[PDB]
Design a protein around this ligand. Structure first.
Ligand SMILES: NC(=O)C1=CN([C@@H]2O[C@H](COP(=O)(O)OP(=O)(O)OC[C@H]3O[C@@H](n4cnc5c(N)ncnc54)[C@H](OP(=O)(O)O)[C@@H]3O)[C@@H](O)[C@H]2O)[C@@H](O)CC1
Ligand SMILES: NC(=O)C1=CN([C@@H]2O[C@H](COP(=O)(O)OP(=O)(O)OC[C@H]3O[C@@H](n4cnc5c(N)ncnc54)[C@H](OP(=O)(O)O)[C@@H]3O)[C@@H](O)[C@H]2O)[C@@H](O)CC1
Ligand SMILES: NC(=O)C1=CN([C@@H]2O[C@H](COP(=O)(O)OP(=O)(O)OC[C@H]3O[C@@H](n4cnc5c(N)ncnc54)[C@H](OP(=O)(O)O)[C@@H]3O)[C@@H](O)[C@H]2O)[C@@H](O)CC1
Ligand SMILES: NC(=O)C1=CN([C@@H]2O[C@H](COP(=O)(O)OP(=O)(O)OC[C@H]3O[C@@H](n4cnc5c(N)ncnc54)[C@H](OP(=O)(O)O)[C@@H]3O)[C@@H](O)[C@H]2O)C=CC1
Ligand SMILES: NC(=O)C1=CN([C@@H]2O[C@H](COP(=O)(O)OP(=O)(O)OC[C@H]3O[C@@H](n4cnc5c(N)ncnc54)[C@H](OP(=O)(O)O)[C@@H]3O)[C@@H](O)[C@H]2O)C=CC1
Ligand SMILES: NC(=O)C1=CN([C@@H]2O[C@H](COP(=O)(O)OP(=O)(O)OC[C@H]3O[C@@H](n4cnc5c(N)ncnc54)[C@H](OP(=O)(O)O)[C@@H]3O)[C@@H](O)[C@H]2O)C=CC1
Ligand SMILES: Nc1ncnc2c1ncn2[C@@H]1O[C@H](COP(=O)(O)OP(=O)(O)OP(=O)(O)O)[C@@H](O)[C@H]1O
Ligand SMILES: Nc1ncnc2c1ncn2[C@@H]1O[C@H](COP(=O)(O)OP(=O)(O)OP(=O)(O)O)[C@@H](O)[C@H]1O
Ligand SMILES: Nc1ncnc2c1ncn2[C@@H]1O[C@H](COP(=O)(O)OP(=O)(O)OP(=O)(O)O)[C@@H](O)[C@H]1O
Ligand SMILES: [K+]
Ligand SMILES: [K+]
Ligand SMILES: [K+]
Ligand SMILES: [Mg+2]
Ligand SMILES: [Mg+2]
Ligand SMILES: [Mg+2]
Lengths: 6, 489, 489, 489, 6, 6, 6
């Protein structure tokens, strides 16, 4: 969750 | 977002090179996540001369030493300062750069990293950049786009002559409109939204957003154990005609399948009989008409039926003629309940009526009906969120413009829905949505809220169909709805 | 195919003995694939004196030494040169041959390899060859046929007095018509099409073919994400009568279940009400008739309804009387949209009408209707692909003659459908197919294309029924369709 | 085998083109079996001008149309008739042929089919053929060799300057010696022996063969339930010295682990004590020596011990000095029991002794001992099956020349063992084999038979080690033996 | 797939 | 077993 | 593998 979001 | 990079640099003090660095490594990590271990691959990084290319140089530099091969094809005339910094580093770390694009250089590489143009595309891609984008598209290699696939206008999702068809797009901070509206959405491939160091305050200051699962989960109305049908509200659907006996059933059932307590249909005799023969849980009131259509002679009967409900849905299968016109405009004008207006209710609507209504309204047009409604061409209104915004704001309503991406707006807040598939591209699917929306208003959500929840769940039900989507029909969609909800929670 | 062996020998220069050798070993490998390790078995190879027997000698020779036992019963008077070559080799390698057939020699063997007659059967099997074929058929041994089971006419699938009932047939190059039409198809058992060295060019130069899974997969229309119901087309079905209220629902739903955007039925009041009570997603227009049948007084209303659709289907349950006759012929004559004509539309059709129509047509008769249509007996038209060809070509249409194998032809290209089972042998199944075909025309496939895809998917849906096929009904078939499609892809 | 193609053509009457065709398609089917579906691959077929290349042309022709691409590089000056026929067909079917070899053409292909030279290689590959073989070897592509990897001498397994390193070799009829002896065996990769139509009689008329699993299964002695140790025989092992106390244990245990009833060791005191401290099931007789070595003063004691056994094994760890020399030669000369002679027994042996012995003998030398034994260099005797043959025949014995492939011969029948791995490349492994062989003679197998079974099982035990083979030691090998046997059956 | 087709 | 032997 | 090594 910290770096990416899809 | 351009305001956002600016603010984070100019006000918050993050060096623009640090933002760039974070952008490039995030692309590297997204590729690795998607492709597995990157050391087997040869990478062809295509770089323009703006910061989008700068991002590219970062990617290229950070693959040097770790992958089988890296080449950069540089295609800009001049370089922005950050792009220049990063070209300079790529070279110092030993990276190879060429400026001419040989058609055949695709053969010696496995992945194309597309860093030609991002949010700074203006107008059309022709010439060398055209040829090249086409070449990559014909190549069957794995294409990764930095921020936005080159050639999508990031504010509309429009293709500017031509555009890169990406397997993966890695964007920074927040998705841009061109990832969300079509055709751009189609050419984005799998989208990852990378956090590159913007303050959270700014990221969340965004006037528009995609409807997420977390957003609908929190909007769902509570189901308190000590309740009864009254708790969950009453809906009246004024619908149907001698031409369209099925629409009302689909609306009614959409209301019930989303948790409404009581759904009363009002449909011309004997067409009303149809609804309860398939779903006897519905109540379907016979209305006596002269010709099989609602007219002014049914106005009072319908206002009486409206006195004891919470929301009224009107329009599916009413028919589009002058009897329905007089009726729908006099009714709406006098109805002091929230209205969901759809279909043929929209086709005959006079919009002053919306302006002179004290109670609220949601309209749910597809672009055919929107065009007609505002006396503009279908091409002008399709995916036109500003037009939708100006219309909601002006007429004090919520607009839900249905499309593969549906826009939901009240004139201030605008949401985009991206759940769904082409099984909803089939008569009846809209008629189910009108009921869902009315149903959630009935359970106490606001019009914006009901509309948001409804388009999400509606699309999500379509996705849960277990066989090919093209075979989906509105009856099955009804059944999938309570599953979308369970799966939401 | 006889032209094909010839060409590959005479023009391409492949020795005919090499083609023979490849034929025989391919039979050996097909048997092994089906039976497992062949060394446990005793083999009785039955050989005539043409090349079919020659193929047999190859098989027999190539089993010598590897299996528990091999005997050849030779039943020809003279031997063709290749057969002679191969008999000569069988003997030199130590093989045993007898010329008299003792009823009881079946006892000492496990597999009968049937190489008596292939494509060179002419006329009837009587006498010794009759007795023998009957004996093998009564024996309960595992029967493997070389090329074609002896006694099937390879051009029609006809049984010439009697014929070998095979567990496995191994044919060379391409399937022959007698494997595809009945009864031949029934007596072929599991069919393997072996590649024996023909150039691919020739193999593919074949004017006729079986509809394959790969062929339908590539014909399926695209479902672009940015779409709406309009993308996927509009169908009108003109159908039903006071006698047949159900047919229209089945057609309408066939159109929807294959991906069409909008299906409008036009059915006599109050019968139209039936459709939406079961499937309210359909739109079912009430047509006012004098007697419960379409007549000329409904011509204009129907032409108006046709102006805004893409394809019109007409015929299921119309009834067969003079009112329907005047109506269907004046309508078709004036309709400038593609037509799918079925059922009672076909029963009352004047065929000059097809000749004087500028727009295209698919007709979908079963052999009862075909017979009536061309004033011939049912036995004359059944499986008569040349007649079907001549009719399509002549009337500028596509013919789909429904049967366990369905022929689909436009007069140039002829396809055979072999998906399906006897659950489709039940009223209503044809009415579903008319909708499927109209539905695929509506989505932009050509008449030939729509018809090909439709008979394949239709048959394949029947096969996916999870309980006994005899219990299948048209309503279930509707539900299985979107599964056939998913499973296709 | 060259005699075999000849005979099948000249005497049995199989057209040589038919044999060629069967060869080429068998290569195609072997590739498919190994690689899966071949249509994804681009194939570069390398063809010389003899029949090996002809085989290549068949392969190439039969891939035309079915694979992504086919190119033939033809590298012969002239073409044999069959090769010429098949080049002619390749071209007529549309195939592409070039005569110049560009280093870079490897890039555009996935599989190299190597059909340059087969059994008709004479002498050294230099020049163009050298460069090319090296190029393919440096390429990392999947290499498939027709019959024999070009450059292996098919009669010795020798590399003629250079040679193709194959992933798969498909050979015709029977394996050739060059697949079985090294280095050829190493460069063959996975070997498939294809049946291409030779009569079985001829195939089985082959004077030499690989020891197969089926052959050892049928040679294993029966274990009748009503038995006792006597049924399964008695062995004496005369072995050990003050230098080598462990060898005898390993031999003794090899005898026991293969099913012998009783194993009596005869070893110098106190070294004999070693054996029973590790494996007390052995009986280990103390022999009184002057210096820690057997001498003539122990001859009679040993002949007494031999009177009541079935076979005597002599040699492991005896030491190589003149006392052992006098002893081993006087003993063997007088012993009228079957002898297994190994190790230092071989080092001091006078071979007239073997000639003047009425009883039978197996010798089990490694090439160091063989060299010494026949006064030749190690390089001269290694893999020299003719030398081994001439020696067995001459001295009326069985020779077992141990090597990664072990030769087992009696002068008439020659077998090659190919089970094993490099964990047997470690002191002690031979000492285990001597016991195994003696043990099977004791159970009633002949010397040839015992020797065949023993080298197979011995190698197979090594393969069943569950950790890396380099860590295997003779003690573990002992334990794996009863598993090799179980797994055999 | 090379030899057979069903 | 018919065609191949390994 | 790109970012970390353990
Ligand atoms: N079972 C029943 O009872 C059903 C009844 N229903 C009832 O039918 C009534 C009329 O509804 P409607 O939406 O079909 O036509 P309308 O409002 O006149 O727009 C007309 C024009 O707009 C265009 N266009 C159409 N869709 C578009 C899109 N998605 N995006 C963009 N453009 C689009 C379209 O172009 P075309 O397909 O003609 O090329 C068309 O010509 C309404 O009462 C409804 O409730 C339906 O729900 C179906 C099932
Ligand atoms: N639920 C509904 O609403 C349904 C309504 N339907 C509607 O019924 C209408 C009349 O259709 P139909 O096909 O039954 O008779 P028609 O066209 O007059 O042919 C008559 C003669 O041909 C023969 N024959 C029949 N089948 C054959 C075959 N497969 N292969 C070969 N021969 C065959 C047959 O011989 P018999 O069975 O009499 O021995 C018969 O006597 C039509 O409007 C249709 O849509 C049906 O779809 C059913 C469900
Ligand atoms: N635990 C114990 O008690 C053990 C005792 N053992 C006992 O040791 C005794 C002497 O046996 P041995 O085989 O080591 O020497 P021997 O017979 O003199 O040959 C000498 C020369 O030949 C060469 N050469 C060696 N191997 C080769 C090969 N495989 N293939 C080809 N060449 C080969 C080799 O060359 P090098 O290694 O010196 O380069 C060497 O110099 C014997 O009594 C035996 O039973 C052994 O079993 C080990 C465990
Ligand atoms: N933040 C990160 O940086 C990106 C923003 O970079 P920014 O530098 O603002 O702009 P971009 O890197 O997005 O693109 C601007 C570059 O593209 C060129 N360009 C714009 N339109 C065309 C055209 N139609 N044909 C050929 N060249 C064209 C510009 O040249 P010029 O303006 O000089 O014509 C400039 O070099 C974001 O997407 C994100 O990656
Ligand atoms: N290609 C391969 O070879 C086959 C073609 O072989 P081809 O040699 O063309 O012909 P076939 O082997 O298919 O059959 C011809 C043989 O059958 C005999 N025959 C034909 N009809 C009858 C009959 N009604 N009663 C008794 N005998 C009959 C013919 O004798 P005759 O013509 O002399 O009467 C001839 O010996 C293919 O199927 C395939 O296997
Ligand atoms: N049976 C099948 O056919 C094969 C036997 O084929 P056959 O035709 O007998 O012989 P091969 O095809 O095995 O090889 C003979 C070919 O190779 C050439 N050749 C032999 N040695 C060399 C060399 N050292 N350098 C360059 N060229 C050389 C020969 O030319 P030339 O003799 O004219 O010098 C001849 O063209 C088997 O392996 C199997 O595939
Ligand atoms: N390609 C698509 N992908 C996802 N959703 C779609 C697509 N096409 C249409 N839809 C959805 O289906 C619904 C259709 O409503 P519309 O009024 O067009 O249909 P109807 O004919 O009344 O039923 C909308 O919510 C819309 O978002
Ligand atoms: N034995 C069978 N096996 C497979 N398919 C069959 C069989 N019998 C009939 N069918 C199929 O079912 C459909 C029947 O159409 P038809 O018009 O006969 O029936 P209907 O009575 O209108 O319904 C055809 O497509 C045909 O191919
Ligand atoms: N690389 C190898 N692969 C398989 N087997 C091998 C290999 N090297 C040696 N061996 C086997 O191990 C045994 C070694 O006997 P040898 O007399 O060399 O060893 P030792 O030192 O007495 O014990 C032989 O049977 C031989 O086949
Ligand atoms: K880009
Ligand atoms: K036959
Ligand atoms: K070769
Ligand atoms: Mg609608
Ligand atoms: Mg019918
Ligand atoms: Mg040794």
């Amino acid at each position: 969750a910290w770096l990416f979001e899809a | 977002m351009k305001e956002i990079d600016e603010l984070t640099i100019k006000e918050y003090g993050v060096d623009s090179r640090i933002l760039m660095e974070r952008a490039g490594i995030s692309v590297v990590l997204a590729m690795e996540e998607e492709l597995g271990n990157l050391s087997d691959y040869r990478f062809l990084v295509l770089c323009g001369g703006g910061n989008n290319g700068g991002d590219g140089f970062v990617v290229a530099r950070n693959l040097l030493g770790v992958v089988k091969d890296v080449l950069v094809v540089f295609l800009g005339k001049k370089k922005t300062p950050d792009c220049e910094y990063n070209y300079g580093l790529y070279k110092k770390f030993g990276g190879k750069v060429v400026e001419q694009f040989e058609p055949s250089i695709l053969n010696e590489f496995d992945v194309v990293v597309d860093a030609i143009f991002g949010t700074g595309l203006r107008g059309e891609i022709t010439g060398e950049y055209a040829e090249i984008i086409n070449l990559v598209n014909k190549s069957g290699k794995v294409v990764v786009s930095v921020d936005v696939p080159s050639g999508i206008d990031s504010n509309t999702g429009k293709v500017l002559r031509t555009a890169v068809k990406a397997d993966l797009t890695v964007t920074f901070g927040v998705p841009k409109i061109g990832h969300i509206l079509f055709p751009g959405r189609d050419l984005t491939g799998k989208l990852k939204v990378a956090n590159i160091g913007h303050p959270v305050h700014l990221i969340n200051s965004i006037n528009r957003y995609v409807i997420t699962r977390e957003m609908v989960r929190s909007l769902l109305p509570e189901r308190p154990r000590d309740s009864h049908k009254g708790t969950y509200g009453k809906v009246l659907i004024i619908a149907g005609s001698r031409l369209y006996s099925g629409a009302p059933v689909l609306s009614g059932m959409g209301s019930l399948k989303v948790g409404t307590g009581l759904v009363k249909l009002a449909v011309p005799f004997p067409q009303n009989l149809i609804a309860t023969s398939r779903f006897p849980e519905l109540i379907s009131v016979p209305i006596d008409t002269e010709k099989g259509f609602f007219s002014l002679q049914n106005l009072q009967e319908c206002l009486e039926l409206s006195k004891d409900v919470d929301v009224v849905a009107i329009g599916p299968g009413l028919g589009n003629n002058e009897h329905v016109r007089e009726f729908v405009n006099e009714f709406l004008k006098t109805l002091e309940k929230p209205a969901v207006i759809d279909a043929d209710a929209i086709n005959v609507l006079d919009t002053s009526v919306l302006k002179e209504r004290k109670s609220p309204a949601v309209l749910t047009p597809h672009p055919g009906e929107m065009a007609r409604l505002v006396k503009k061409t279908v091409g002008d209104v399709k995916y036109n969120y500003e037009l939708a915004e100006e219309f909601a704001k002006e007429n004090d309503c919520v607009l839900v413009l249905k499309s593969a991406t549906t826009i939901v707006t009240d004139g201030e807040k605008t949401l985009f829905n991206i759940t769904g598939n082409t099984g909803l591209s089939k008569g009846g699917s809209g008629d189910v949505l009108t009921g869902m929306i009315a149903g959630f208003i009935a359970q106490g959500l606001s019009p914006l809220e009901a509309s948001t929840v409804s388009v999400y769940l509606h699309g999500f039900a379509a996705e849960l169909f277990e066989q090919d989507e093209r075979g989906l029909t509105a009856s099955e969609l009804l059944r999938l709805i309570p599953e979308a909800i369970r799966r939401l929670k």
